[PDB]
Design a binder for this molecule. Structure first.
Ligand SMILES: [Mg+2]
Ligand SMILES: [Mg+2]
Lengths: 49, 49
């Protein structure tokens, strides 16, 4: 949404003027971050951890 | 002597208040449709100076 603005001084019986909320956007992308590792089944067994 | 009154809505004089929220004014308006006709103009005599 656009920022807060100010009302204006107006004559009696005069038309109230339009200053409605105006919009824009911020685009998102979303980059895929990835990480991997591999462990041999023999060492999955043998390690003390 | 017939006073013929016509209204698209109801029968009598149509008087309405309304508000203009763009200008902050109350309008008061009145309307009526009317005609007057004799059925027998012989049934009336005017007095003349
Ligand atoms: Mg303003
Ligand atoms: Mg503005």
């Amino acid at each position: 949404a656009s920022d807060e603005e100010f009302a204006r001084p107006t004559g009696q019986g005069a038309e109230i003027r339009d200053d409605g909320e105006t919009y824009t956007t911020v685009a998102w992308n979303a980059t895929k971050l990835t990480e991997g590792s591999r462990v041999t089944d023999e060492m999955r067994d043998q390690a003390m951890v | 002597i017939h006073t013929i009154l016509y209204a698209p809505n109801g029968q009598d004089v149509e008087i309405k208040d309304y508000e203009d929220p763009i200008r902050d004014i109350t309008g008061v308006n009145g309307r009526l449709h009317v005609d007057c006709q004799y059925s027998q103009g012989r049934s009336s005599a005017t007095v003349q100076y």
